[PDB]
Amino acid sequence: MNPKRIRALKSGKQGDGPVVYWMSRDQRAEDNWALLFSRAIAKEANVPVVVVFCLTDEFLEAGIRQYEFMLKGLQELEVSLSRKKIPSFFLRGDPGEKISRFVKDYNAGTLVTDFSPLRIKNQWIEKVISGISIPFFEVDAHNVVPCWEASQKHEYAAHTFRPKLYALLPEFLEEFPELEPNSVTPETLSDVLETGVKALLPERALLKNKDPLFEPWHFEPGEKAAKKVMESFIADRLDSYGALRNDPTKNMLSNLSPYLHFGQISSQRVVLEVEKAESNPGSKKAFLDEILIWKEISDNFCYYNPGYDGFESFPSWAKESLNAHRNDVRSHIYTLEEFEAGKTHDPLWNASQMELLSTGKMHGYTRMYWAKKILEFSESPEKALEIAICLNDRYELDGRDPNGYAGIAWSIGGVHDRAWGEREVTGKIRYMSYEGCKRKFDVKLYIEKYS
Numbered sequence: 001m002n003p004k005r006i007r008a009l010k011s012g013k014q015g016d017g018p019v020v021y022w023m024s025r026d027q028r029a030e031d032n033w034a035l036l037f038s039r040a041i042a043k044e045a046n047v048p049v050v051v052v053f054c055l056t057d058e059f060l061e062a063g064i065r066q067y068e069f070m071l072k073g074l075q076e077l078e079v080s081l082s083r084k085k086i087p088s089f090f091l092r093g094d095p096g097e098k099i100s101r102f103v104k105d106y107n108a109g110t111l112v113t114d115f116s117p118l119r120i121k122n123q124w125i126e127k128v129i130s131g132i133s134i135p136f137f138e139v140d141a142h143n144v145v146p147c148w149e150a151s152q153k154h155e156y157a158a159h160t161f162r163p164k165l166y167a168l169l170p171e172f173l174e175e176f177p178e179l180e181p182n183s184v185t186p187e188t189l190s191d192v193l194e195t196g197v198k199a200l201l202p203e204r205a206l207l208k209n210k211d212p213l214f215e216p217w218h219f220e221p222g223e224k225a226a227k228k229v230m231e232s233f234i235a236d237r238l239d240s241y242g243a244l245r246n247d248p249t250k251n252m253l254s255n256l257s258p259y260l261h262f263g264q265i266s267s268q269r270v271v272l273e274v275e276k277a278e279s280n281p282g283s284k285k286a287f288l289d290e291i292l293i294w295k296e297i298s299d300n301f302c303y304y305n306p307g308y309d310g311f312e313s314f315p316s317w318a319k320e321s322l323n324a325h326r327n328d329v330r331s332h333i334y335t336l337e338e339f340e341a342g343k344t345h346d347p348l349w350n351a352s353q354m355e356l357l358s359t360g361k362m363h364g365y366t367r368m369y370w371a372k373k374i375l376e377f378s379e380s381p382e383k384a385l386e387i388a389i390c391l392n393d394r395y396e397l398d399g400r401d402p403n404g405y406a407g408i409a410w411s412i413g414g415v416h417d418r419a420w421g422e423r424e425v426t427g428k429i430r431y432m433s434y435e436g437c438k439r440k441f442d443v444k445l446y447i448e449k450y451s
């Protein structure tokens with residue numbers, strides 16, 4: 001285990017009870033440096049490792065679609081951890097109260113968590129630090145290169161982050177040891193799920209017919225399903241990925257993001273397996289650029305920019321340009337509700353929103369298109385950011401994620417982009433025209449599918 005993957009969050013006085021892994025972002029038993037590090041600390045302290053997960057109060061800010069995907073994954077995780085003789089505890093409430101109380105009730109010796117750069121995770125961490133007296137570590141289990149090691153700062157372009165990340169892959173891209181079971185064995189999620197579904201139901205996304213919009217069969221949740229999606233991608237989709245990743249009418253992406261978001265599969269795992277695959281040269285470079293460079297620069301962005309969801313984090317050239325065009329008359333303005341129902345005058349935009357509504361995963365190419373039009377048809381960049389985040393986090397299975405904040409900030413604010421030709425309203429932000437998409441893929445066919 002490379003000690004550069006683990007960081008101290010708070011010194012303390014070690015207790016003599018179990019080591020507690022507060023699982024949050026990496027909801028898997030295999031390929032999990034945070035669990036592996038926790039198991040190892042336990043072994044040196046001659047105590048078991050246990051897993052705690054907090055079912056937080058914020059679940060009512062998203063939908064059934066994410067709550068069910070996540071909890072059906074955790075049901076499977078319970079079984080897997082128990083086979084390793086690792087108990088798991090699911091705490092209804094927010095971490096400050098529930099983790100601090102768990103630590104005390106169970107006499108935890110050491111507390112470990114996984115790494116998320118999101119504001120809510122840091123809020124949770126502050127409240128836990130004030131409720132405990134034992135040592136508290138975090139482990140980057142989501143990036144191949146620990147986020148605080150990849151760069152010491154915000155990287156303004158993929159081309160400045162790329163050479164730093166690739167210079168560290170020889171060290172950090174490595175196989176995973178097997179998780180050692182514990183020596184000995186030291187409200188069901190079903191009922192939790194039902195309680196939570198009851199609370200969510202009034203806000204469920206319904207057609208006018210009251211029929212639910214969401215189709216829950218496009219991505220089966222859990223660690224075992226994630227691995228099959230990974231295996232089918234490498235076998236059937238990787239070869240064509242370079243040619244087809246920008247064609248939303250084709251189903252040729254990996255479809256791994258919902259699994260990667262909740263940590264039901266390790267990206268380090270996916271990279272290991274892609275690296276060993278013999279596939280079309282070009283396709284592997286393209287995929288690895290997305291799952292290494294662009295995914296891990298998103299953690300870089302959220303980690304070094306506390307205002308990652310606000311206009312103030314845009315590059316100076318984009319803030320200046322959007323400000324210069326802030327009083328340009330927009331050709332249309334849409335309300336949040338009009339965006340949300342796909343009721344604009346742009347049928348490609350509406351189709352993209354319909355794909356989000358019905359499957360919980362909008363094709364990566366039309367996400368770019370979709371966020372850029374929110375900029376073009378809202379009162380201001382700040383309002384555009386709020387609308388894009390709202391809809392992305394409400395309806396994307398892979399939402400509430402650094403990739404999301406960074407992808408929206410790329411779209412609307414030019415983060416990790418350069419200035420392009422000056423237009424009214426959108427200024428020098430990269431523009432993606434309708435006619436452009438028409439020359440790129442079969443727009444009429446995409447609209448047909450999602451209408």
Ligand SMILES: Cc1cc2nc3c(=O)[nH]c(=O)nc-3n(C[C@H](O)[C@H](O)[C@H](O)COP(=O)(O)OP(=O)(O)OC[C@H]3O[C@@H](n4cnc5c(N)ncnc54)[C@H](O)[C@@H]3O)c2cc1C
Nearest residue numbers: 253254255256257290291294295364368371399403404407
């Ligand atoms: C406006 C906008 C919002 C986005 N919101 C999210 C979000 O909430 N959550 C999310 O996980 N991704 C987000 N993305 C990034 C990207 O669209 C998705 O990760 C991707 O479409 C998921 O499909 P896939 O797994 O089939 O992708 P693939 O093309 O197979 O890529 C494999 C993995 O690479 C990573 N990746 C790919 N593209 C990007 C990218 N542009 N930025 C960062 N990582 C990337 C993801 O982890 C993805 O699962 C957003 C992009 C934009 C433009």
